[PDB]
Amino acid sequence: VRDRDLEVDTTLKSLSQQIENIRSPEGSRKNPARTCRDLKMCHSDWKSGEYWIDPNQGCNLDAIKVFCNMETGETCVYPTQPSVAQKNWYISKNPKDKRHVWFGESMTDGFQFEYGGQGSDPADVAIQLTFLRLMSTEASQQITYHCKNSVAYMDQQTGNLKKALLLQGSNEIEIRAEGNSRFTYSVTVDGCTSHTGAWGKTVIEYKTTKSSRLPIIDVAPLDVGAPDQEFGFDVGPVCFL
Amino acid sequence: DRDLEVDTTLKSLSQQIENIRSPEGSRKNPARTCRDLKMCHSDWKSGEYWIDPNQGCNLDAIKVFCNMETGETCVYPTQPSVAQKNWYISKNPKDKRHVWFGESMTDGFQFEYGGQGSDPADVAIQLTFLRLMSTEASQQITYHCKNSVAYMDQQTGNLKKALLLQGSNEIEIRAEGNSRFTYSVTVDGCTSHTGAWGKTVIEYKTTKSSRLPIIDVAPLDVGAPDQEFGFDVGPVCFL
Amino acid sequence: DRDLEVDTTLKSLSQQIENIRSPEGSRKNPARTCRDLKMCHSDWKSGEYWIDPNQGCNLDAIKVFCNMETGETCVYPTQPSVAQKNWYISKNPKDKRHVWFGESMTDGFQFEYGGQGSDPADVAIQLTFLRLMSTEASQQITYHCKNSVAYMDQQTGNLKKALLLQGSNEIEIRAEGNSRFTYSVTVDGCTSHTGAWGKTVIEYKTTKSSRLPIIDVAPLDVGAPDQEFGFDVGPVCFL
Ligand SMILES: [Ca+2]
Ligand SMILES: [Ca+2]
Ligand SMILES: [Ca+2]
Ligand SMILES: [Cl-]
Numbered sequence: 001v002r003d004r005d006l007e008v009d010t011t012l013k014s015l016s017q018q019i020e021n022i023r024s025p026e027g028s029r030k031n032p033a034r035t036c037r038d039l040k041m042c043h044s045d046w047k048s049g050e051y052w053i054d055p056n057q058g059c060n061l062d063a064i065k066v067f068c069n070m071e072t073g074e075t076c077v078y079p080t081q082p083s084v085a086q087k088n089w090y091i092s093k094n095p096k097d098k099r100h101v102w103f104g105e106s107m108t109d110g111f112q113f114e115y116g117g118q119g120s121d122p123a124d125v126a127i128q129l130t131f132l133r134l135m136s137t138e139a140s141q142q143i144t145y146h147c148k149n150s151v152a153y154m155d156q157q158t159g160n161l162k163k164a165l166l167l168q169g170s171n172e173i174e175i176r177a178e179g180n181s182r183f184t185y186s187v188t189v190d191g192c193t194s195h196t197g198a199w200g201k202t203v204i205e206y207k208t209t210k211s212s213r214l215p216i217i218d219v220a221p222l223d224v225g226a227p228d229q230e231f232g233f234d235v236g237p238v239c240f241l
Numbered sequence: 242d243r244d245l246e247v248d249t250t251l252k253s254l255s256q257q258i259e260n261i262r263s264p265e266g267s268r269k270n271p272a273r274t275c276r277d278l279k280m281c282h283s284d285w286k287s288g289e290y291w292i293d294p295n296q297g298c299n300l301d302a303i304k305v306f307c308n309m310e311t312g313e314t315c316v317y318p319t320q321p322s323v324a325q326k327n328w329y330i331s332k333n334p335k336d337k338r339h340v341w342f343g344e345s346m347t348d349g350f351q352f353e354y355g356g357q358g359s360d361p362a363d364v365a366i367q368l369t370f371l372r373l374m375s376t377e378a379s380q381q382i383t384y385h386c387k388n389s390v391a392y393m394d395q396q397t398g399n400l401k402k403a404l405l406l407q408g409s410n411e412i413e414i415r416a417e418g419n420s421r422f423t424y425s426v427t428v429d430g431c432t433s434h435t436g437a438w439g440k441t442v443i444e445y446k447t448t449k450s451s452r453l454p455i456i457d458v459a460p461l462d463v464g465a466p467d468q469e470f471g472f473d474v475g476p477v478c479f480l
Numbered sequence: 481d482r483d484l485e486v487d488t489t490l491k492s493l494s495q496q497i498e499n500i501r502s503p504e505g506s507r508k509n510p511a512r513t514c515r516d517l518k519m520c521h522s523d524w525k526s527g528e529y530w531i532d533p534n535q536g537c538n539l540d541a542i543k544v545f546c547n548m549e550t551g552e553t554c555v556y557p558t559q560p561s562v563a564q565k566n567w568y569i570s571k572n573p574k575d576k577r578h579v580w581f582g583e584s585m586t587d588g589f590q591f592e593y594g595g596q597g598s599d600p601a602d603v604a605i606q607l608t609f610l611r612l613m614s615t616e617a618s619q620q621i622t623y624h625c626k627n628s629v630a631y632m633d634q635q636t637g638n639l640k641k642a643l644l645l646q647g648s649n650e651i652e653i654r655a656e657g658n659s660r661f662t663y664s665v666t667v668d669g670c671t672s673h674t675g676a677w678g679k680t681v682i683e684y685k686t687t688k689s690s691r692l693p694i695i696d697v698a699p700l701d702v703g704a705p706d707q708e709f710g711f712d713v714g715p716v717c718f719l
Contacts, residue, residue, distance in 0.1 A: 038536030
């Protein structure tokens, strides 16, 4: 028989701690917070890093593992597969005709990008993203196009953007190099501007208040088709602030 | 003895906390959605539960059918059964005007959901939240007909006399045309005028869950005094 | 002995659990919306409460007026009162052009809400949630006018000089046109140039609540140095 007083005092501390964990979750997997923005706001001193969150609440078994930037409050959700190998992915029955073709939708062994990490169910994560968009004022994502004999953005020969690749946003919105300036991506470095027989890369960013457009789920290069034209991707996380 | 009052309180506090972390789906402790109940209690089975998708005060919680195989929350119409009779006499046998039951017929009404004496405005907020917490929705509706084509016309072999449906965000769902705004038909017993009762069963299923539930129906083959219809309106189910 | 200790701790735990299930709407224990407060505590009085519709951490709670007769949550502009003076001088008698106070006039600014020293980005997220939990929203604005038509022009009897409103959604709200996007007026003392102050009181009410609150105003009948105006901006109210 357990000593009664110590048992009661132990239950009391445990009940008190259970209530505290409801009020102030620590962002562990058993005890996930709502967003990184909430963690930051409520815990000024906590360090940037990995935390679990459950923005759609209810049952917490669908919580997602994310990086919180505690300087900015950003919640960053990683694609399930950050890295797409660098190789030839497509040969057209017509080398000379350069046209946009979707990696995920039309290329042998292509896939549309998924988010959350290898354990997750995408339908659950889609619900989580919906709540994250609701709890943020903007979102941003970066993607790197790795290139060998493949223009990504600016064509050095012509000086124009007509061979630039297309991105597919999350709600059937294309994001482009040109056009309406609220649907256009920006480019920080562009090492793909000519065919050199060597590898370069172009780094592309989209930031918007219309967070329904992110993340990116597909990429359509144009300057592809000939058999020595190779590319690959590093897909960054979609970050909500 | 006498102070196991304390053990009772401790057990009750512990249970109140558990009901918060993981609601049982009772009226007192409603869960958020059937999806959450299935997720948190994998051994629980299909049937009626109380949910509160919009949280806050729990007094506007709604009683639903949870399909615990799929995770669907199924929200019933307040009046599933609509009487079978002549609802409409036109100045005509121009039996080829769509006329809304709810917006236009005498004693017609647009369909409400939630059951009990739910307040429809509370329930609209709940449906708003169920849409956020699901990826698709579907709904079935039965058209009972007496001398009234529903979908296919045996005479002409075509759909030009098909009824149309109104969705929740005012979208019109039709027999033909764009694949996205199109309803399907499982059984079609309304194809000719025979003096007897028949029925036609219709489904719509979509990822644009704003379009559901159905709030109105506009038959076309109505107007003469010998033409009668009714409905069974199924639940709107969110997955 | 020290059952004083134990029963005091049991009470405190029972209370903290209560505060989570039924927040009181204080700054430390904010409720979700006024609607929820009314629903759960029908005896509570209209007044100032703190709410946190977006939940998570509660430090971004906003202070609101709850109308406990209606269930309305009213969120006040940070600066309800905009001074009455000449704000804009054109190269004019043209005319007769809409000029946005916020986007275009010197010293003009778009309207922020939440007050205290809230962060507009935080309040915008709260309004997103307020909109999800409400069926309807309204707001009233007063245009104080000296030699400036706001709505009806008495020399013409037309609304062609009526000011424009900018809603939160972008979305212009206008005197005329499609009826879902028009404002109404309950007072119009601006119909002629008298050299004295008058005012026009405008209201917009909609189920499409992402159009509210109003964030900017474009008068048309401005541009000369003798033309002056100011605003009293009402709360945006949600139900
Ligand atoms: Ca969850
Ligand atoms: Ca509720
Ligand atoms: Ca909050
Ligand atoms: Cl929520």
